[PDB]
């Protein structure tokens, strides 16, 4: 059968499937686009966050004021009005950072001496990395022993005294403090990553080159996350006074790109960092996507008329190569972020190259701009700044303005009109055609780089709306008291600025996200007004209505099963019906207990809200249900010292007898005790560490807690509607060793879930690990941007 009809069809189908899979793999290996998750920046002026950068760009403002008077510069003989005297600069102004002199060595594991030895560049890079990691939404403490690449772009320069002469207290740390490799080695060591760490020095085009490398390791597959950035800062006026010898610096210090009055390029300083991930991986895990990088190209200009002389053919070739790698055409680009350094000779060459590379096949004019007009030349910090500007403009749907462009140059020809200089803001709305942009960077060494950036896919739309009645806790942590106070003040301020936010979104973002730190605060407000009230109360200093407490290197909790003493319970049908964990575990144990003890689950767990024969089995049942829900809520137990019925409860929890079997044995105990009236576990009646198997039929306060504390467990948690013997334990807390805290579960008739919210808030208040995804799970809460960590900086300088 199947003669020549079915036999070959199956093989043909299999071969076609294999060919399709192989070609798909080829395409993925060659041209997989990458996605930008988050960005971080530090620019001259008051700019410290990308929002301020976009606000400055939209309002059209420059950030050039003068020179710094903090870094011990002479400032005086720096310009004898004769240009050619030794030690005479030419720039009477510029754009410089005002925060480089300050640092916070306490937050990191850094000693004041070696902190004084640390270069400002890596000093800024550490903060940039931490801020971008928090902005992405990934807890910075989760990235441990994982493949994550770091790529940095710097220029060595100099900071302090020479190594030969040494210092008085800081001698051994001089070498590591000033070295380009340590700039990324320190980041890798602090964050505990394991991917490649690379520092690249390729002049003003360094930063872009870095991201190019970050776009390759991700594509090949040697790393699953990349952090690429650049930095430039000046602790010495040497660069200006040496560049003035070439007479290439404009006096005032501005960039008049494509203007009739070009005089120089000026200098500045800054820092930028981006986080990159494969698009499929990022979308699989739900990480945010801001823009997509598709193709990059790096080239050299070859032999020219000197090292500083630029080339046009190389730029054209690199642009065409980037376009070919991206697999697009010259007509798919709407705007370009040209270099626009503002020099006399560079501008015509770059303009001609861009013309010949883009505008020959163009129906619509191409917009051109340069960020160096607003901020000046930032050396290696540039390149990434252009990328940030382009992505911000594309997201906001507006093209910003370029300054000092009202007087177009006279050495270039614009007869074709294919390139229109950006002098006024231009709307950039969404449409059928996706938006794309290109960024160029050229270095004085002779290396050129080009990149193409595209908008994120418009698939986020389609979110639904769901409501609920469960209130969720709010938590916030920091490493110092003032840090906690400032964080609370900033959160209250931001919540004041932006109204309409649901409590669920803020609760979820302040959930998994910010890391776990010594100083913690937690609460649970009904609405936002009382939330602001308690937040301002925390900001003032007196913590009332919330929970606080330091906890250094504490990660364990202890479950203790108290005996009788929580009587009258306060029947909670809401616990049984609202919580499904009860409605499963307690239901199972109850129907296990039903056949033996004639009493049903209907009669008194129906409750008349308005006898050891009955209570003890039901207290055991509700105890095991509560223990199950607690352990499912992320908090695991430890050795249990449960007394009386607590012995059977601990037997059930630690694995001595099964739920049905433990229920049956407690029913037998109740039936034999209703006549006379009228996993590591810690033994109670003997006081020893025992295995969970010896507990049998034959088996049926001070020294115990001393030994448990001496072991290393310093907290006690009892599952009871009313905490009993708490003071007895509490009095012991100061009596020996470290202090002891006991957390209640319920209150006097307060069976509402809000009581459990307070219990959880008190649990997190003192060194207890809680699985927040488990307690949130399904609520529809989505990520929401929040302010980053506020620091406490101090002056750290070392004069030469």
């Amino acid at each position, epitope marked *: 059968a*199947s003669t020549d009809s*079915e*036999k070959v069809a199956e093989y043909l189908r*299999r071969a076609t499937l294999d060919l399709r899979a192989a070609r798909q793999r080829i395409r993925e290996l060659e041209g997989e686009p990458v996605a930008v998750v988050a960005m971080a920046c530090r620019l001259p002026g008051g700019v410290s966050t990308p929002e301020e950068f976009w606000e400055l760009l939209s309002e059209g403002r420059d950030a050039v004021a003068g020179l710094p008077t903090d870094r011990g510069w002479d400032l005086d003989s720096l310009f004898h009005p004769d240009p050619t005297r030794s030690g005479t600069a030419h720039q009477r102004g510029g754009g410089f950072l005002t925060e480089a002199t300050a640092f916070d060595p306490a937050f990191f594991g850094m000693s004041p001496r070696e902190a004084l030895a640390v270069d400002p560049q890596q000093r800024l890079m550490l903060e940039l990395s931490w801020e971008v990691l928090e902005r992405a939404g990934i807890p910075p403490t989760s990235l441990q022993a994982s493949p994550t690449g770091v790529f940095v772009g710097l220029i060595p320069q100099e900071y302090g005294p020479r190594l030969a002469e040494g210092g008085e207290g800081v001698e051994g740390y001089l070498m590591t403090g000033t070295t380009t490799s340590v700039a990324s080695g320190r980041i890798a060591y602090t964050l505990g990553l394991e991917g490649p760490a690379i520092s690249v020095d390729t002049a003003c085009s360094s930063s872009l080159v870095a991201v190019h490398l970050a776009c390759q390791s991700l594509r090949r597959g040697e790393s699953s996350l990349a952090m690429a950035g650049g930095v430039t800062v000046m602790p010495t006026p040497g660069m200006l006074v040496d560049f003035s010898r070439m007479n290439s610096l404009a006096p005032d210090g501005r960039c008049k790109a494509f203007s009739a009055g070009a005089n120089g390029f000026g200098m500045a300083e800054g820092a930028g960092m981006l986080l990159l991930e494969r698009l499929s991986d990022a979308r699989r895990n739900g990480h945010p996507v801001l823009a997509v990088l598709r193709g990059t190209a790096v080239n050299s200009d070859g032999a020219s008329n000197g090292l500083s002389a630029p080339n046009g053919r190389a730029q054209v070739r690199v642009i065409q190569q980037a376009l070919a790698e991206s697999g697009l055409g010259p007509a798919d680009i709407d705007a370009v972020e040209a270099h626009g350094t503002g020099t006399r000779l560079g501008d015509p060459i770059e303009a001609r190259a861009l013309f010949e590379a883009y505008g020959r096949d163009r129906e619509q004019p191409l917009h051109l701009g340069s960020v160096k007009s607003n901020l000046g030349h930032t050396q290696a910090a540039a390149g990434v700044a252009g990328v940030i500007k382009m992505v911000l403009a594309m997201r906001a749907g507006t093209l910003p303005r370029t300054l000092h462009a009202s007087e177009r140059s006279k050495e270039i020809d614009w007869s074709s009109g294919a390139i229109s200089l950006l002098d006024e803001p231009e709307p950039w709305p969404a449409g059928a055609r996706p938006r794309r942009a290109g960024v160029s960077s050229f270095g004085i060494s002779g290396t050129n780089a080009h990149a193409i950036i595209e908008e994120a896919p418009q698939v986020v739309e389609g979110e639904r709306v769901e409501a609920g009645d469960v209130v969720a806790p709010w938590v916030l942590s920091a490493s110092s008291a003032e840090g906690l106070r400032a964080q609370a003040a900033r959160l209250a301020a931001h919540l004041r600025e932006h109204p309409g936010q649901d409590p669920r979104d803020i609760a979820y973002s302040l959930a998994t996200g910010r890391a776990a730190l010594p100083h913690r605060a937690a609460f649970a407000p009904v609405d936002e007004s009382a939330a602001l009230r308690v937040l301002d109360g925390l900001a003032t200093g007196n913590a009332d209505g919330a929970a606080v407490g330091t906890s250094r290197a504490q990660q364990r909790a202890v479950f203790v099963f108290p005996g009788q003493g929580w009587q009258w319970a306060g029947m909670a049908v809401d616990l049984l019906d609202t919580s499904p964990v009860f409605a499963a575990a307690l239901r199972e144990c109850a129907d296990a207990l039903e056949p033996h003890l004639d009493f049903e689950v209907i009669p008194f767990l129906r409750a008349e809200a308005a006898r050891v024969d009955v209570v003890q089995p039901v207290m055991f049942a509700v105890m095991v249900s509560l223990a199950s829900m607690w352990r499912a809520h992320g908090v695991e137990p430890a050795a249990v010292i449960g007394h009386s019925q607590g012995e059977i409860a601990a037997a059930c929890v630690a694995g001595a007898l099964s739920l049905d079997d433990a229920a049956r044995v407690v029913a037998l105990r109740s039936r034999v005790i209703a006549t006379m009236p009228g996993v590591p576990f810690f033994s109670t009646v003997t006081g020893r560490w025992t295995q969970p198997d010896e507990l049998d039929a034959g088996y049926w306060f001070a020294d115990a807690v001393r030994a448990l504390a001496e072991q290393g467990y310093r907290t006690f948690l009892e599952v009871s509607a009313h905490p009993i013997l708490t003071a007895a334990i509490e009095e012991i807390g100061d009596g020996s060793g470290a202090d002891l805290s006991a957390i209640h579960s319920l209150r006097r008739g307060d069976g509402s879930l809000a009581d459990f919210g307070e219990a959880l808030s008190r649990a997190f208040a003192a060194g207890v690990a809680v699985d927040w995804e488990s307690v949130h799970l399904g609520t529809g809460a989505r990520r929401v941007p929040l302010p980053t960590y506020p620091f406490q900086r101090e002056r750290v300088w070392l004069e030469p």
Partner: antibody
Framework: EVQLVQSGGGLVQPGRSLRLSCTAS????????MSWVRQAPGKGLEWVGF??????????EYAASVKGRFTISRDDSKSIAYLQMNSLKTEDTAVYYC?????????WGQGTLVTVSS | DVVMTQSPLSLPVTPGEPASISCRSS???????????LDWYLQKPGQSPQLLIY???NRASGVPDRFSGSGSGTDFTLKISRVEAEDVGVYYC??????????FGPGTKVDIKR
């Protein structure tokens, strides 16, 4: 993907019927004539029977032994394959796999248990 | 009739150095069109069967490489260049000249050399 996910099974006394369902998904079920194979505990895999595609007629073939008590259904609407039992015996206790091809045995299912005893 | 295919029974292996299994036949399996109607199957311990090589020498997608089939229409062979610890189980030769294939045959066995 191209999951199959079989269903059915259990324990039945000798002389009884049962239904086994194979649920094709993740691919076009139009012309992918499938088959049923049986693996006894302690021995190798022995073929039971395949059902052709409707393009070539939709006929079926069986290999002796189980010829008179085994029938195959080809519900195209839900892309479901059915194996129907008839008067089972004790020696038929085996794990049943639902394949994808008729000559080239492609992606396999997960198997059932079905034991006959008393 | 049939070609009564057979294999060299059990073969213990060790991690590292390669291994191979031959497969003989009585009637040539080279079809007139110019192809060999042979394939190989692998059954893992306590798991569903799997397909490795079809039509003489062709690796199906998803196979973790390291497997190579070869041979003329009478003396086929399947060789593994690198031997790991998880590629242990039962291996079956299979033909396609006769459509009413009743059984997969005995099949060879592999284990850890000791």
């Amino acid at each position: 993907e191209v999951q199959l996910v079989q269903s059915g099974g259990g324990l039945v006394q000798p002389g009884r019927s049962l239904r086994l369902s194979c649920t094709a998904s993740g691919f076009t079920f139009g012309d992918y004539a499938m088959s049923w194979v049986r693996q006894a505990p302690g021995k190798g895999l022995e073929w039971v029977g395949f059902i052709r595609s409707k393009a070539y007629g939709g006929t079926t073939e069986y290999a002796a032994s189980v010829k008179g008590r085994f029938t195959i259904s080809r519900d195209d609407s839900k892309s479901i394959a059915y194996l129907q039992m008839n008067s089972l015996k004790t020696e038929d206790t085996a794990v049943y796999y639902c394949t994808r091809g008729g000559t080239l045995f492609d992606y396999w299912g997960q198997g059932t248990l079905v034991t006959v005893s008393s | 009739d049939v070609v009564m295919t057979q294999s060299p029974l059990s073969l213990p292996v060790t991690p590292g150095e390669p291994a191979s299994i031959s497969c003989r036949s009585s009637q040539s399996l080279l079809h007139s069109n110019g192809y060999n109607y042979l394939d190989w199957y692998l059954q893992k311990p306590g798991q569903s069967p799997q397909l490795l090589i079809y039509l003489g020498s062709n690796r199906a997608s998803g196979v973790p490489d390291r497997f190579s089939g070869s041979g003329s229409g009478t003396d086929f062979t399947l060789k593994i260049s690198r031997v790991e610890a998880e590629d242990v189980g039962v291996y079956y030769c299979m033909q396609s000249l006769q459509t009413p294939r009743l059984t997969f045959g005995p099949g060879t066995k592999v284990d850890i050399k000791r």
